[model samples]
Target chain A: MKAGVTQTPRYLIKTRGQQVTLSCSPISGHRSVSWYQQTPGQGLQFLFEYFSETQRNKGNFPGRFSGRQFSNSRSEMNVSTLELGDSALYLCASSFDSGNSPLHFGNGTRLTVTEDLNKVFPPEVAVFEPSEAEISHTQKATLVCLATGFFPDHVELSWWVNGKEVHSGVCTDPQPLKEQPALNDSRYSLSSRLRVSATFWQNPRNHFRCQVQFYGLSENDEWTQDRAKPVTQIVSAEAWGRAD
Target chain B: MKQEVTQIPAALSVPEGENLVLNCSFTDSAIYNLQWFRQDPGKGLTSLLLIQSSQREQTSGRLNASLDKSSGRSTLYIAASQPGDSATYLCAVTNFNKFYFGSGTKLNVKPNIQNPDPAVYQLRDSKSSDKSVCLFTDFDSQTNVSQSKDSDVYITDKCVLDMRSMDFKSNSAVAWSNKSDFACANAFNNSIIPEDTFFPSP
Candidate 1:
């Protein structure tokens, strides 16, 4: 599909000896142009130029990269001899030639000079219920969700009641590292509790869901989705017999 | 530490003008403090008494408590049981911030038609761990027993007399009323009850 008339391509791929070009359209009736390159692990580096149909000021850049603005009020940037270091985000900004006019930016294009390549431990989650004798006479019932045996304690625990998540009555403990008797290294375990009222607990039809989302490396060491399936437990009808 | 607390007489029924006793036992640790609470039906709990190791016996008005560490028993005594006193009694033994509770005892005091006006005893001196004598008549046991001003001997003479005497047998710690203002010596005539005694009305 077309990426629109003045829209630069979202991404571009190139080999060592190739050249790539990107274009940007400024806001209506503006003439100045600014360009920047944002590489991984660093702030944006300027390769900018201001113009009123002609280059006014130049920015820090090598001779291989060139930037220009035409009388059409749009701009273009070209890079010759693509290298692995050229993989970065290319941004295009524009402003009016008048003094004090603010710069307007476009969603930058991502340029890749070469193919780049890169993985997390998923947590084991389970829901536990109190014993019949533990809370038989108490007015409140507590349910626990334990997520354990995973490295990098970056995790999220959620409790869902009747297919919807409940936030008010839930509590979570600290994720402390455990020196397992059998494991080779230390792992983290976190327990979250869901305390419900007598009104919510007595209904046998209510169901509870416990979800543990591990926020560890998955996609190229990037924080990815919580792909684990949620586990749930249903209250037995006979449990109502134990209520006062 | 697994702290266990047990309360006896899961349910109790007594007639007005009688006395009430509740027992609680715990295991596995040295109890720092023992407490008794009264809870009315569907109401909040009211703290009745608290006794620590320093005080083996503590009393406040109609409430009395004795903690026997050797037997691991803590007893709560209520004098002149009334209908207002009928409620669930809970025993809690605490060690530092940790606490263990017994199941609870449900007490019901029935109206006594024979004698609705039961005697109430207010211990004049609770610091004494000695035997005390109470009188149903208008006589004073405190002034008669010891003439010295430093004497701890005192009487809580009301309608039906109540006494918290030291070393007195558990079964013989009760005294009743009579038709006249006569200091009945037989009321506390046990030889096991030492030192302080109740004399005839002067």
Candidate 2:
């Protein structure tokens, strides 16, 4: 389990603490090292770096990433959620000097992100409590995103107005927060609430949405998964009361 | 004023893209808007397509409905049947508001393998709700599929002909069809249908 030697990859379902340490052999060869995002089928993007435990460079990556060199030539890096696009395959390279140096290499445990391999049943979405009586404009209303029967408990929630993305009044809870998890079941249930103005009561333009995203194995989901994404859940505004 | 189902499909499974014929025979020539509908399991019956004796032949996507007065029969021809085409096929004879239904033919459509065809199976115009007649389109892939367009299905537990004219108020509006069409609704004649519309006629 020491740094430097290529130990069997440790599979991880990237979560909150959201950390994955890439260990390379004793830094006896070179000290300067960095990581690269080798997206599954896509190209690579440089992510992070360090010159002797003293950080000297950083990649054009989102803030979720951070790294530092360890004793015995170990350089550990981590990314929260890691993102689906950044599924894994982060590379590690070092040199005796700066960016252009003929870098030494270390492929120890190349962060091969782990995917959830549970029975992923496509979650259902619905409006738990729909308004039946009439109301006025600019009024506050709570619309819930009822997500049920999904596994592994990791999802991304989003909202849309008309056909565009909207950010205000959006609240997504952490793993089983107010969102309840199934009892003795691998399946899970989640509810994301979106607060929209009564103006969204009318037809057409008032059309809003709620969506959820989670992980699934390629083969197990090939038949059901969307080509562009994984098992998703989406629901739109239907009818409640007077929108006039 | 009454008719009978001389024969039924006997719960046979039909292959996708293949044709299926559900015979509804009658001795009288006065069967106005003879119709055909399918009853989903645990749910109310939903009209697939209805035909009048005058029309002779009508094609809705892959379902070809034909009425032959000479033979005293109406045949429901299902073409290249894709996913979600499973249900019992019944023939109902319009008796004013009271419709007399036949014993019914239980059709078993072969599961759609690979990319058989598409859902939104059938869609046409958008006239007065009742005027927009459509036939089986891609209403398959059922509930799990996303996108309002792909999941638009007019499914229900009621035997409604003009799904377009009807609002999602009656039953739970689970899905909506791509577009609105009701040409095949000629036989959903307004009126209280007989209780045994499943096998009303002799």
Candidate 3:
């Protein structure tokens, strides 16, 4: 993340049930873009953040919610197949310019959906271990999830903390979904992976739940594990207590 | 006699497989027990190796401790450092119940991406003391783009090529002498043309 968020191109999201995207450009010094789904009564859930035109963090987001840092250094977050419930202020903040610097958030865009959403398939879910190479960077711990066989191909992916959702560290998302054919019928499989710190996943003690919510569907599925899988990857034994 | 140890670099940052040589030399030649220990934040020190000064070499998984009594010194060599291996490495001596530990040498087992970059400001060499300014480079030029046509001007990411004439005697007269280069110092082999500010071309 760097400096100020700038003016964006006019958003032309016309017609109901049409998936629309909103974008933001970091003014100067700033390049990384963080996208947040601001709902009614909830605080900004640490959605996802990126830097240097690279996907730095993959928080609890699926494919519908995606972001990119154009060669121009301007960043854009796209939300496809927008639904009526998707109406909310989507915030884009920038920085970690200096690890200690406060992030400069965008004015944010207010989204609206006039029509009801159509039927979509249900999403299947599973958790995976971190990769060996990814483990080399100790603080950069990763948690993988394959949320396959979903419909309308839209869902929210993120991790929930002891109570509220937390991404205390950086969260990133680049690959939302590529629509590999689901085994069954019209259903399709799309996977999402949220990268967090070993700090969050070290123990089942600091309970975290993986939540997947389908846009058109009212139902959301979540699962929690009793114990954290012993990560032999690259976690520093000294990182006993989650160090930011 | 009281045993004393000395180290070249008390603090360093390097890559994983980079074999670190902690040159630990003592004052006493009649050495008995020579040891090495690693310490962590707020944690008690743990012994890594204990070898008699007479032993030529001793080896662990990736840790090698060698003694050259002739030089009255012992060296701790790490084959491949890991992320968990960052800590203060100290050379110690004496027996189990007792220990004479030397002041530690800090080790940062990072990815070893440390590269010392260019001159902070304009520099005028002593030989060409009248004037020869080396400007700070913006490094904004693309590889596809053509560069300055002047043979005296050299553009580089490491250091900006300012104005240096062929009249200069040597690199030492220019300023940033790569005459003696090391991994720690981002340097390049010299050429007949002494471009601006003794700096290396990327």
Superior candidate under lDDT, 2 versus 3: 3
Model 1: DockQ score: 0.01
Weakest ten-residue segment in model 2 chain A by summed lDDT:
A129-138
Score every model by TM-score. Answer: 0.27, 0.29, 0.29
How well is each residue in B1-202 modelled by candidate 1, as lDDT tens digits? 6667888898997767898889998875476677787765322345577776566887989999898976788899999998668788978665543445577888866543321211212111112112222322222222112211211221111111221221110011112222233233444333233343333232
Model 1 stretches astray by more than 4 angstroms:
A1-6, A115-244, B1-202
Q: Report the C-alpha lDDT of model 3 over A91-164, residue by residue, as the tens digit.
A: 67665441323345565665545432232335555444433233333333444334544544345566555656
Q: State fnat for each of the candidate structures.
A: 0.00, 0.00, 0.00
TM-score of chain B of 3: 0.51
lDDT (10s digit) by residue, model 1, range A1-244? 6232244765554546678789988777677776767654433455756576666655557888987778786888899988878877787756563223434556677665543211123466655443232233334454545565554344557777776777655545423334243542345555555556545666667787777755433222223346542122221111121233
The C-alpha local distance difference test score for the whole of candidate 3 amounts to 0.47
Q: What stretches of model 3 exceed 4 Å from their correct place?
A: A1-244, B95-99, B112-202
- The 0-to-1 C-alpha lDDT of every candidate, in the order given, reads 0.53, 0.45, 0.47
- Candidate 2 or 1, higher TM-score: 2
Off by over 4 Å in 2: A1-118, A128-138, A177-185, A220-244, B1-202
- In Å, residue A44's CA in model 3 sits off its true spot by 49
DockQ, all models: 0.01, 0.01, 0.01
Which ten residues in a row are the worst by lDDT in model 1 chain A? A230-239
